[PDB]
């Protein structure tokens, strides 16, 4: 269509349109519903543009584009054929940050510990964090395992 709307930018992030149908060609569920408000009950959404009724939105900032929720079970959502501008980014491995967890409260700043630092509370996570990674018959027993050496030579480089 020539006389259609303009080219949707920023991978549909700031999208505030009204399309309520998926690429699969399916309906769409009410952002705030008995189904969709339980699936959302775990993620890390963001404002930018509201979750108006049931129109495709990109709340989580999903880089593949705006989507609808199609049903209730996990993975039952689907993307929208929003007609985005440019092809998506290709963040070279650790090129895309992923500003990770806080000590159960956003923004560290006053962050100090012994030499490890847990991030799971202990009450629920259980036990073993404090000394994870340290295999008993090796790191604790100060003996190296057969190929560790090889894993190591990679790090610092051979060229």
């Amino acid at each position: 269509s020539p006389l259609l709307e303009t080219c949707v930018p920023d991978r549909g992030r700031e999208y505030r349109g009204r399309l309520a149908v998926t690429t699969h060609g399916s309906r769409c569920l009410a952002w705030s519903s008995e189904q969709a408000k339980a699936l959302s009950k775990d993620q890390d959404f963001n404002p930018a543009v509201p979750l108006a009724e049931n129109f495709c939105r990109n709340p989580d900032g999903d880089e593949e584009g705006a989507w609808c929720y199609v049903a209730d079970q996990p993975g039952d959502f689907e993307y929208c054929d929003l007609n985005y501008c440019e092809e998506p980014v290709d963040g070279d491995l650790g090129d895309r940050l992923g500003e990770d967890p806080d000590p159960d409260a956003a923004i560290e700043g006053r962050t100090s510990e012994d030499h490890f630092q847990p991030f799971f509370n202990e009450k629920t996570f259980g036990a073993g964090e404090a000394d994870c990674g340290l295999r008993p018959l090796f790191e604790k027993k100060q003996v190296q395992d057969q190929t560790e050496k090889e894993l190591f030579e990679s790090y610092i480089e051979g060229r």
Partner: protein, 259 residues
């Protein structure tokens, strides 16, 4: 695990074996991350187009082993599940985007010299080690070769197996298949030039891709075995679930559990 060597008794103590009770069948693998919660590839529990959808009563877990068969009377710890959390947006329709799950033991297992939790990376160490060219380890009892004449029996590693695999450049990563590689995945494996072989084949899903931190010399889990096209195929590089990105979810689930 293709072209890999046997694992040493005691090597990876977070290596969990997740298998369905009846019939008794090895499904995938996983990692113990604490005394009570377990991480595994979501597709191991649910995959709609193939009609896969096990529930808790369907499968048990087995921590602390070596041979993918033979009750190791002393060292193991057979235990039932309780929770089973799959990601609300585990894109199973298109490209296994967020192939992360998160099981819970029924009762906290007890630690041992063979049963010990791996570490969930943090932003800092996650920065320093996530660089194309460094290597890692993907373990498991998944198939040795990628085919067999008759009976897959003939392609199932006896003991555990291990292979050290190197991280590739996201560019060449994208370049191995029209399957949309997502922001939160990462392909690892050798290059066509490079000479060395090795790859986590079928059956390997869930098994972790752990990396040793020179600082603090602890073991961390960067990824999880998720998807790939065949095994050791010159050209194709295996893919893994980027656990670091999904870590914020893991937090959001685990501490919401009551207290």
């Amino acid at each position: 695990i293709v072209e890999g060597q046997d694992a040493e008794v005691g090597l990876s103590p977070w290596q969990v074996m997740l298998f369905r009770k009846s019939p008794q069948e090895l499904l995938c693998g996983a990692s113990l991350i604490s005394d009570r919660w377990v991480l595994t590839a979501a597709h191991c529990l649910l995959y709609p187009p193939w009609d896969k959808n096990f529930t808790v009563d369907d499968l048990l877990v087995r921590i602390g082993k070596h041979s993918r068969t033979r009750y190791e009377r002393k060292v193991e710890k057979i235990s039932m599940l309780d929770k089973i959390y799959i990601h609300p947006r585990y894109n199973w329709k298109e490209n296994l985007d967020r192939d992360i799950a998160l099981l819970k033991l029924k009762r906290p297992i007890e630690l041992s010299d063979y049963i010990h939790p791996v570490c969930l990376p943090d932003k800092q160490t996650a920065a320093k080690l996530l660089h194309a060219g460094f290597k890692g380890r993907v373990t498991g009892w998944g198939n040795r070769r990628e085919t067999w004449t008759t009976s897959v029996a003939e392609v199932q590693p006896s003991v555990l197996q291990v292979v050290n695999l190197p991280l590739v450049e996201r560019p060449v990563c994208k370049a191995s298949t029209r399957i949309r590689i997502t922001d939160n995945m990462f392909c690892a494996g050798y290059k066509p030039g490079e000479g060395k072989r090795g790859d986590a084949c079928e059956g390997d899903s869930g098994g972790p891709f752990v990396m040793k931190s020179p600082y603090n010399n602890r073991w961390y889990q960067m990824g999880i075995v998720s998807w790939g096209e065949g095994c050791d195929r010159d050209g194709k590089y295996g893919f893994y679930t980027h656990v670091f990105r999904l870590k914020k979810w893991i937090q959001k689930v685990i501490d919401r559990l009551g207290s």
